[PDB]
Amino acid sequence: MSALLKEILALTVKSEAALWKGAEQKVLSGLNNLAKTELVQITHHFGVNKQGSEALWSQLDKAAVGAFPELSVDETLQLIDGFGECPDSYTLSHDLNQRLLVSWEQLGKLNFQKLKETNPYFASDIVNQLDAAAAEFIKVRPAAESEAGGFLNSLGVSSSFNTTKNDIYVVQSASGKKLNNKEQREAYVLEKAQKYLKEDPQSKILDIIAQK
Amino acid sequence: SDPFKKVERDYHNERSVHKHFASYPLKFWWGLNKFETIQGIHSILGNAADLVVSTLSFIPGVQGRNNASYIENSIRVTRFRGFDDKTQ
Amino acid sequence: MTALFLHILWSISYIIINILYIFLSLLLSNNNEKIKQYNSNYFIKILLVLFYNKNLSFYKNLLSEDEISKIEFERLKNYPTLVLIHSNLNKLEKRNKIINSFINFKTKYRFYKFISTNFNLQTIIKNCNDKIIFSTLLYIVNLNYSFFYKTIKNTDLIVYLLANKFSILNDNIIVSKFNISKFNDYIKYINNTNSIDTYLEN
Amino acid sequence: MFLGIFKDVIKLLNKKVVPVYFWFFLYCFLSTMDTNIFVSSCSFLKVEVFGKDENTTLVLLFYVFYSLFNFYLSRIKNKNNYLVRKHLYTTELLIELILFKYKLIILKFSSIKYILNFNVRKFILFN
Amino acid sequence: QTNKEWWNLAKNIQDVKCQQELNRYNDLLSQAYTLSLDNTIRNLVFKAKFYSWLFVINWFKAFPDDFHPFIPGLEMK
Amino acid sequence: NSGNALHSEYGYLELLSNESVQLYKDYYESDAEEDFKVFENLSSKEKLVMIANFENNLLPKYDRSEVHLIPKRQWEPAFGVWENFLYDITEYASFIAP
Amino acid sequence: AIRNFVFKISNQIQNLAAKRSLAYLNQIDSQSVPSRATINMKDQVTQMQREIDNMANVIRAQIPDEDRAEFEILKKYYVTGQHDSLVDPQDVLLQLDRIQVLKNLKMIELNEE
Amino acid sequence: PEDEGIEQQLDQQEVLLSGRYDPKLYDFQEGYTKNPEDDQTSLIEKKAF
Ligand SMILES: CCCCCCCCCCCCCCCCCC(=O)OC[C@H](COP(=O)([O-])OCC(O)COP(=O)([O-])OC[C@@H](COC(=O)CCCCCCCCCCCCCCCCC)OC(=O)CCCCCCCCCCCCCCCCC)OC(=O)CCCCCCCCCCCCCCCCC
Ligand SMILES: CCCCCCCCCCCCCCCCCC(=O)OC[C@H](COP(=O)([O-])OCC(O)COP(=O)([O-])OC[C@@H](COC(=O)CCCCCCCCCCCCCCCCC)OC(=O)CCCCCCCCCCCCCCCCC)OC(=O)CCCCCCCCCCCCCCCCC
Ligand SMILES: CCCCCCCCCCCCCCCCCC(=O)OC[C@H](COP(=O)([O-])OCC(O)COP(=O)([O-])OC[C@@H](COC(=O)CCCCCCCCCCCCCCCCC)OC(=O)CCCCCCCCCCCCCCCCC)OC(=O)CCCCCCCCCCCCCCCCC
Ligand SMILES: CCCCCCCCCCCCCCCCCC(=O)OC[C@H](COP(=O)([O-])OCC(O)COP(=O)([O-])OC[C@@H](COC(=O)CCCCCCCCCCCCCCCCC)OC(=O)CCCCCCCCCCCCCCCCC)OC(=O)CCCCCCCCCCCCCCCCC
Ligand SMILES: CCCCCCCCCCCCCCCCCC(=O)OC[C@H](COP(=O)([O-])OCC(O)COP(=O)([O-])OC[C@@H](COC(=O)CCCCCCCCCCCCCCCCC)OC(=O)CCCCCCCCCCCCCCCCC)OC(=O)CCCCCCCCCCCCCCCCC
Ligand SMILES: CCCCCCCCCCCCCCCCCC(=O)OC[C@H](COP(=O)([O-])OCC[N+](C)(C)C)OC(=O)CCCCCCCCCCCCCCCCC
Ligand SMILES: CCCCCCCCCCCCCCCC(=O)OC[C@H](COP(=O)(O)O)OC(=O)CCCCCCCCCCCCCCC
Ligand SMILES: [K+]
Known part of the structure; x- marks a missing residue:
């Protein structure tokens, strides 16, 4: 158990082909013997090491699907x-992807929910930070709508939360370091947009930035 | 129902207790008519309701107030005239 | 009930203005092409800002996307009660289009890895796992900025927001939002803004 | 454009803007107790409910039933889910309650003359 | 020449460097005049006479809010 | 667009007050019967008094009054009284007034 | 003639409005009366804000430590979250109810010790 | 040119340098007081004057 884990x-760490094959074989044989952890x-x-046979990964997917309910937060993460960081040729069956998406x-x-309950200003602070440098059309977005039902939804009328959106964002660094100027911010945004476009050619970040 | 019994006069019924304890906390709001602000609010609401009724009076069976009539104007205007909370 | 009273009065005014518009159309040249040439007029723009809604036929096809967006922006910027009335009217749309995102775990994790590499999420959330912070940020974006999903891709919008947020400073920052048109907001804004800090770039 | 105006009128009279409760209240206000279909036929409502100058027993029973039902519904909703945006009216009521608590604290720990002077100065500054 | 209540109020009041700004708190600082007494009949008659005389003497003084010689302020703080 | 001042318009006034104090100090530098420590921790009224005598010597000393030409819209007889009046009103609201 | 007179009136009105709105920037008026008025307005605003803060500070000092946390929550809400839509008062109410749960536990312990 | 602003500055200089307003020649007093009393203004106000 512990010795086998240390050997793996x-x-x-060594990252040798024969060692990886031997590992794959031993782990495949002892999947059932080993516990969930x-x-x-x-x-x-x-x-993390970027190795593993397709059959081994498929059987690991099957085992994870089988033992998913008995997983904690750390195990899920x-x-x-x-x-x-699995091998590329690991197209998974349409149950483990769903389980992972739902869990995440x-x-x-x-x-x-926990952060908002601990500090009600968490969401407000995050939204203000996001909208500080955001564009005017981004700020123009409507306000949240009440989804609660009852008299106000059936027999009455509930006024919307939308209000005037002409606000000024004053940004101050908590630490006190000098903030970036307009040109520096433009350069940073352009560099990030270029990197994102390189990662995904179809992104419209260029148009989004050019809009305002 | 039988409203006839209620209409009938009776010594004990007349001299019995008509308003009980529970009604006082539920009806003490009627003393707010003493305040000129409350009187003005009520007059404004009544005038607005009369205007709405007049505008919607085109439908059959609904007639709005006529300014020519003296009784309607007098009753609408002297409702709070001489109001005194101290005298029963 | 105040909202109902305002809506009723606005409806009466809108009906009267529509009757006047029909009468003017039937009296004058009666050409929509001619009418469209005055959409840039000062008073025509004021009238549009006052009595234009996407759920009503007034100037239904006489305005372009840019003009409609400008009118909406002006109303949202400098017209509180008109904004209230038109936001109440917008409830008639009943769009309620809820769309999920990140169906594929592979794509979701690739996007998460890119965001983690290009940004530090500890600044946004302190003492929390990076994946948990990423999921929380996705949930916040879905709650708030999902309105643009009709036209803007969710990943592109998230990247744009993160880049704009991190452009100010690659560290924790404090943001205060003020509406100087309001008395309390104006007093707080003038009290909190200091020239020395602006000069020092803090 | 007449059809467009008719559609606009229908939309402006739509439920989401002009409540059906408002329509019912207007109908009751315009109609008498013998013409109102909802109560003219029903003798209980016209006599036992709205026909008594004092109906404290029935009012108390109705209030108890309503209170129990609403408490049950609120408890069930809170137990099930809580991350749902609430109505503006309820949100404003809660905000007003919190502000009232803070104002009570301020009045308790501050003098009436000081409160009056501060309010007068603030009003003058607002003007 | 002050008291513990006024000292507590002044120390709680922070970040004030102007006499006019402190005078804006003059009503709050007036709470230092506790004048604690019981409500016995004699003490009530006293309180009545003393407060009426205080009103009269303040009328005769006719000092404004700017000049409050009997309300300790920035110097003592 | 409003009579109220913005945040960027108050650092200038603070610098005006400081400049007035420094101008007084510079002018009365060579005066024995002068104590400048009194200028430390001034009250609001004292700051206003100093700002009253503040002066800026880098401004041009000549009068800034001048004439600006705003071209008009000549009356068009081909339109009519009401059409020309509306044209004048929209011109005033769009170009002449701003 | 009439148009020239109307434009003269408009020019005088616009000059008056510009003066009344931005006379605090220049020293055209001797003694800088508008500048002093604007400085006084800002001083009054800052003094009012600092007065609110100092009243909060003194109440905090005088408040019992048991409900000092509740006072802090109420003060922070009244200052920031009253005007913010994203701040849900339900969370503040939940915090107050947790404090009340602790207080009720202590009360019952005292009653039934 | 006889510019208005420059002429105003020059006339102010002329009036103040004429010597008729030398502070040494004046004993500043409140005036409105029943008795003759010196100037009661603040030290900052005196320096500003
Ligand atoms: C004037 C015209 C009259 C026309 C009459 C025609 C007849 C038909 C009338 C139809 C309307 C009534 C019936 C249907 C109601 C439906 C409500 C509904 O489902 O909406 C959900 C609606 C949802 O709110 P919301 O839209 O999200 O807005 C959030 C606000 O927080 C919620 O507030 P708001 O900002 O939305 O505005 C409402 C607000 C107030 O708004 C108004 O003032 C309303 C103004 C009039 C509106 C009229 C609308 C209807 C117009 C119909 C006619 C159209 C005609 C068209 C044809 C052409 C006409 C020419 O009401 C309150 O919340 C008041 C609560 C506090 C009590 C105030 C009164 C007592 C004084 C207390 C003072 C305390 C001070 C501190 C202590 C001091 C100690 C000394 O719920 C409520 O508003 C709940 C209100 C609960 C209290 C109501 C009763 C108290 C008095 C109200 C104000 C006075 C008017 C009373 C009626 C008068 C009738 C004549
Ligand atoms: C968001 C919320 C959501 C809520 C949800 C939940 C809601 C649940 C449902 C709630 C429903 C609630 C519904 C009800 C709410 C509203 C209730 C309501 O209407 O109440 C408001 C109620 C309505 O007033 P009203 O009865 O309609 O007014 C009658 C009109 O003024 C007509 O008066 P008049 O013309 O026939 O004769 C009096 C004359 C004025 O002529 C006089 O001068 C009368 C003088 C009378 C004698 C004063 C003696 C003072 C010496 C001490 C007392 C000696 C003992 C004898 C006192 C006898 C009574 C006065 O008045 C005028 O013409 C004044 C012009 C009117 C415009 C200005 C208004 C100013 C405020 C009103 C009071 C002004 C008093 C001025 C006194 C003189 C100042 C130099 O207002 C008042 O009660 C008065 C204002 C508030 C006073 C507060 C005082 C607090 C204690 C102060 C102590 C320290 C100072 C003591 C000495 C005095 C100062 C030096
Ligand atoms: C039924 C007839 C109704 C009509 C007639 C009403 C009376 C005539 C009109 C008088 C009008 C002017 C006011 C004169 C009295 C002023 C007293 C005063 O300011 O003393 C300061 C005294 C000391 O206050 P402090 O220094 O600020 O702080 C005290 C702390 O608690 C710190 O204290 P501690 O914790 O260290 O413990 C000590 C504390 C302990 O105090 C307690 O809380 C313990 C409670 C023990 C049981 C209380 C009941 C027994 C005494 C009843 C009063 C005598 C008979 C009244 C009826 C006469 C006709 C049959 O005691 C004291 O501090 C001293 C209290 C002695 C003063 C009150 C005694 C006289 C009151 C009656 C009026 C005087 C004239 C009577 C003329 C005819 C007979 C000669 O203030 C009070 O405690 C006032 C309490 C409320 C008094 C309300 C008025 C009297 C009610 C008596 C009961 C009557 C039945 C109920 C229904 C009444 C009709 C609605
Ligand atoms: C409402 C319900 C009924 C009333 C309930 C009870 C009262 C509740 C409200 C009041 C609660 C607080 C009570 C007072 C607490 C203590 C306050 C305090 O600290 O004041 C002391 C005050 C401190 O102020 P400060 O430092 O001088 O600063 C001056 C500032 O202006 C700053 O001045 P301030 O803001 O400190 O002003 C002090 C003023 C604060 O209090 C007030 O302002 C009063 C507020 C309530 C009354 C408001 C009345 C408003 C009237 C106009 C409105 C319309 C009325 C219509 C009426 C119609 C019906 C008649 O104190 C008072 O006057 C307290 C009076 C309380 C009794 C009120 C009742 C009076 C009834 C009179 C009836 C008429 C006469 C008899 C009958 C005649 C006809 C037959 O003075 C002292 O410390 C005195 C020290 C003793 C020696 C003085 C020597 C003076 C002569 C030498 C001068 C030169 C000195 C040497 C050279 C210079 C230095 C080197
Ligand atoms: C003591 C009493 C108590 C109150 C205090 C006293 C108040 C005194 C107020 C005095 C006001 C003086 C105003 C002087 C204006 C001078 C204009 C001028 O330079 O003249 C040259 C001008 C030369 O015309 P132009 O510019 O060469 O154009 C001709 C082109 O060939 C044609 O060019 P185009 O075809 O290319 O384009 C233009 C064409 C394009 O077509 C249009 O745009 C025509 C539109 C027609 C009206 C559509 C709405 C129909 C519904 C009824 C009205 C409801 C109000 C809404 C109105 C919306 C806007 C029109 O429209 C025209 O033809 C323009 C002229 C239209 C005249 C016909 C309408 C007159 C009555 C208007 C309503 C008056 C208020 C009624 C209130 C309710 C009474 C029960 O003269 C005219 O042709 C029109 C002169 C009009 C003089 C009006 C004098 C009114 C005096 C009595 C006032 C009181 C009335 C009753 C109410 C009482 C309430 C208490
Ligand atoms: C229809 C009813 C009408 C009622 C109107 C009655 C008006 C009475 C007006 C009296 C004015 C007296 C002014 C002089 C100063 C009085 C003392 C003072 O300043 O108070 C503060 C004093 C001082 O109290 P304190 O020391 O706690 O003051 C707190 C403030 N600091 C901290 C600064 C000290 O208060 C008292 O001592 C108690 C006052 C209330 C006493 C009540 C007694 C009973 C009253 C019965 C009703 C009125 C009499 C009968 C009327 C009959 C009419 C037909
Ligand atoms: C078992 C359920 C039976 C009833 C079911 C349908 C009821 C629907 C209508 C609700 C009742 C209306 C009664 C009207 C007649 C009346 O009350 O008649 C009794 C008196 C009549 O007043 P007046 O004497 O001034 O005419 O009413 C009052 O004094 C006012 C009481 C409130 C009435 C309206 C209802 C308010 C909401 C009730 C809950 C809040 C607390 C109430 C007090 C405990
Ligand atoms: K300005």
Whole structure:
């Protein structure tokens, strides 16, 4: 158990072809013997080290689907990281992707709820930070609509939350470091847009920036 | 129902208790008519309702107020005249 | 009930203005092409800002996308009660178009990796896992800026927002929003803005 | 353009802007108690509910039932989910309650003369 | 020449460097005149006479808010 | 567009007050019967008094009054009284007034 | 003639408005009366804000430490979240209710110790 | 040119340098007081004057 995990770690660090084959074989044989924690750890290690056979990854997907309900937050995060830094030729079946997507969305929603309850100004601060340098058309967006039902939704009329959107954003650095000027901000945005376009040719970040 | 019994006069019924304890906390708001501001608010609301009724009076069976009539003007104007909260 | 009263009066005014518009159209040249040439007039623009809604037929096809956007921007910027009335009217659209995103785990993780590499999420959220912060930021964007999903890609919008936020400073920042048209906001804004800080670039 | 005006009138009279509750209230206000279909036929509403100068027992029973039902609904909703935007009216009521609590604290720990002077100065500055 | 209540109020009041700004708090600083007494009949008759005389003497003084010699302020702070 | 001042229009006034104090100090530098420590921690009224005597010597000393030409729209007889009146009103609201 | 007179009136009105709106920037008026008026307005605004802050500070100093947290929450809300739409008062109410839960627990402990 | 602003500055200089307004020749007093009392203005106001 512990010795096998240490051997897998050492072989992954060494990064030799025969060692990877021997690992793959041993882990494939002992998937059932190993518990959920060991399986998650080895999957994360294989993902970070960028190795593993397609059959091994498929069987790992099957095991993860089978044992998903008994996973904690750390185990889910490690599995997500491994399946993210998995080998390219690892087209997964349409259950593990769904499980991971649902788990990630639920974790995000729960974190948002907890942070908002701890500090009601969390969402307001994030929105203000996002909209500080945002464009006028971005700021023009409408306000949130009340989805709650009842008398006001059935027999009454509920006034919308929209109000005038002519506001001035005053940005001050908490640490006190000098802030970037307009030209520096434009250069930073252009560089980020160029990098994003290189990653994805179809992005319209150029048009978005040129708009305002 | 039988409104006839209620209409009928009776010594005990006349001299009995008509307003109970529960009604006082539910009806004490009627003393706000003492305030000129409340009287003005009520007059404005009544005038607005009369205007709405007059505008919608085109439908059959609904007639708005006529300024010519003396009774309507007098009753609308002297509703709060001489109001005194101290005298029962 | 105040909103209802305002809406009713605005509706009466709108109906009267539409009757006048029809009468003027039937009396004058009666050409939509001729009418469209005055959309840039000062008083015509004021009238549009006053009685133009996307859910009504007034100037239904006589305005272009740019003109409609400019009218909406002006109304949203310098007309509180008109904004209230038109936002109430906009409820009649009942669009309620909710669209999911990031269907493929591969694409979602690739986007997360790109965002993590090109930005530091610890600044946005302190003492939290990077993936959790990324998911929370996605949820915030979906809640707030989803209105643009009709035309703007979610990933592109998120990248634009992150780049604009990080352009100011690659560190924690404090943002204060003020509407100087309001008394309280104006007093707070003047009290909080200092010339020395602006000169020092803090 | 007449059809367009008719469509605009229908939209302006739509439910989301002119509540059906407002329509019902207007109908009741314009109609008498013998012409109102909702109550002319019903003797209980016209006599037992709205026909008594004092109906404290029935009012109390109705209030108790409504309070129990609303408490049950609120508890169920809170237990199920809470990340739903609420109505502007309720939000404003809660804001007013919080502001009233803060104002009570300020009045408790401050003098009436000081409060009056501060309010007068603030009003003058606003003007 | 001041008291502990006024000292507490002044120390709580922070970031004030102008006498006019402090005078804006003159009503708050007036709370230092606690004049604590019981409500016995004799003490109530006193309170009545003393407060009426204080109103009369303040009328005779006719000092404005700017000049408040009996309200300690920035110098003592 | 408004009578109120913006944030960028108050640092200038603070510099005006400081400049008035410094001008007084520079002018009365060679005066024994002068204590400048009194200028430390001035009250609002004292700052206003100093700003009253503030002066800016880098401004041009000649009068800035001048004449500007705004071309008119000659009356058009081909339109009519009301059409010309509306044209004049829109011109005033769009070009002449701004 | 009439047009020239109307334009003269308009020019005088515009000059008057420009003066009344921006006379605090220049020293055309001797003694800088508009500048002093604007400085006085800003001083009054800042003094009012600092007065609110100092009243909060003194109330905080005098408040019992048990409800000092509740006072802090109420003060912060009244200052910032009253005018902010993104700040949901439900969360503030939840914090107040947690504080009240602690207070009720202490009360019941005292009652039934 | 006889520019208005320059002429105003020159006439101010002439009036102040004529010597008729030398402070040494004046004993500033409140005036409105029943008794003759010196100037009661603040030190900053005196320096500004
Ligand atoms: C004037 C015209 C009259 C025409 C009459 C014609 C007859 C038909 C009338 C139809 C309307 C009534 C019936 C339907 C109501 C439907 C409501 C609904 O479902 O909407 C959901 C609606 C949702 O709100 P929202 O739109 O999201 O807005 C959020 C606001 O927070 C919510 O507020 P708001 O900003 O939206 O505005 C409403 C606001 C107030 O707004 C108004 O003033 C309303 C103004 C009139 C509006 C009229 C609209 C209808 C017009 C119909 C006629 C059209 C005719 C068209 C034809 C042509 C005519 C020429 O009401 C309140 O919330 C008041 C609560 C506090 C009590 C105030 C009164 C007592 C004084 C208390 C003072 C305390 C001070 C501190 C202590 C001091 C101690 C000394 O819910 C409410 O507004 C709830 C209101 C609860 C209280 C109502 C009752 C109290 C008095 C109200 C004001 C006075 C008017 C009373 C009626 C008068 C009738 C004559
Ligand atoms: C967001 C919220 C959501 C809520 C949701 C939930 C809602 C739930 C439902 C709630 C429903 C709530 C519904 C109800 C709410 C509203 C209720 C309502 O209407 O109440 C407002 C109510 C309406 O007033 P009203 O009865 O319609 O007014 C009658 C008209 O003024 C007609 O008066 P008049 O013309 O026949 O004769 C009096 C004459 C004025 O002629 C006089 O001078 C009368 C003098 C009378 C004798 C004064 C003696 C003072 C010495 C001490 C007392 C000696 C003992 C004898 C006192 C006898 C009573 C006065 O008045 C005038 O003409 C004045 C011009 C009117 C415009 C200016 C208005 C100013 C404010 C009104 C009071 C002004 C008083 C001025 C006094 C003189 C100042 C130099 O207002 C008042 O009660 C008065 C104003 C507030 C006073 C507060 C005082 C607090 C304590 C101060 C202590 C420290 C100072 C003591 C000495 C005095 C100062 C030096
Ligand atoms: C039923 C008839 C109604 C009509 C007639 C009404 C009376 C005539 C009109 C008088 C009008 C002018 C006012 C004169 C009295 C002024 C008293 C005063 O300011 O004393 C300062 C005294 C000390 O206050 P402090 O220094 O600010 O702080 C005290 C702290 O608690 C710190 O204290 P501690 O914790 O260290 O403990 C000590 C504390 C402990 O105090 C307590 O809380 C303990 C409570 C023990 C039981 C209380 C009931 C027993 C005494 C009843 C009063 C005597 C008989 C009244 C009826 C006479 C006709 C049959 O005691 C004291 O501090 C001293 C209290 C002694 C003063 C009150 C005694 C006389 C009151 C009656 C009026 C005087 C004239 C009567 C003429 C005819 C007979 C000769 O203030 C009070 O405690 C005032 C309390 C409220 C008094 C309300 C008026 C009297 C009501 C008596 C009950 C009557 C039945 C209920 C219904 C009444 C009709 C609605
Ligand atoms: C409302 C319900 C009923 C009333 C309930 C009770 C009262 C509640 C409200 C008041 C609560 C607070 C009570 C007072 C607390 C103490 C306040 C305080 O600190 O004041 C002391 C005050 C401190 O002020 P400060 O430092 O001088 O600063 C001056 C500032 O202006 C700053 O001045 P300030 O803001 O400090 O002003 C002080 C003023 C603050 O209080 C007030 O302002 C009063 C507020 C309530 C009354 C408001 C009345 C408004 C009247 C106009 C409105 C219309 C009325 C219509 C009426 C119609 C019906 C008649 O104090 C008072 O006057 C308190 C009077 C309280 C009794 C009120 C009732 C009076 C009734 C009179 C009836 C008429 C006469 C008898 C009958 C005649 C006909 C037969 O003075 C002292 O410390 C005195 C020290 C003792 C020696 C003085 C020697 C003076 C002569 C030498 C001068 C030269 C000195 C050496 C050279 C210079 C230095 C080297
Ligand atoms: C003591 C009493 C108590 C109150 C205090 C006292 C108040 C005193 C107020 C005094 C006001 C004086 C105004 C002087 C204006 C001088 C204009 C001028 O330079 O003249 C040359 C001008 C030369 O015309 P032009 O510019 O060469 O154009 C001709 C081209 O060939 C044709 O060019 P185009 O075809 O290329 O384009 C233009 C054409 C294009 O077509 C249009 O645009 C025609 C539009 C027609 C009206 C459409 C709406 C129909 C519904 C009824 C009105 C409701 C109000 C809404 C109006 C919306 C805007 C029109 O329209 C025209 O032809 C323009 C002239 C239209 C005249 C016909 C309408 C007259 C009545 C208007 C309504 C008056 C208020 C009624 C209130 C309700 C009474 C029950 O003269 C005219 O042709 C028109 C002169 C009009 C003089 C009006 C004098 C009114 C005196 C009585 C006032 C009181 C009336 C009753 C109400 C009482 C309330 C208490
Ligand atoms: C229809 C009813 C009408 C009622 C109108 C009554 C008007 C009475 C007006 C009296 C004015 C007296 C002015 C002189 C100063 C009085 C003392 C003072 O300044 O108060 C503060 C004093 C000082 O209290 P304190 O020391 O706590 O002051 C707090 C403020 N600091 C902290 C600065 C000290 O208050 C008292 O001592 C108690 C005052 C209330 C006493 C009430 C007694 C009973 C009253 C019964 C009703 C009125 C009499 C009967 C009327 C019959 C009419 C037909
Ligand atoms: C078991 C349920 C039976 C009833 C079901 C349908 C009820 C629908 C209508 C609601 C009741 C209206 C009664 C009107 C007649 C009346 O009350 O008649 C009794 C008196 C009549 O007043 P007047 O004597 O001035 O005419 O009413 C009052 O004094 C006012 C009481 C409130 C009435 C309106 C209802 C308000 C909401 C009730 C809950 C809030 C607390 C109420 C007090 C505990
Ligand atoms: K200005």
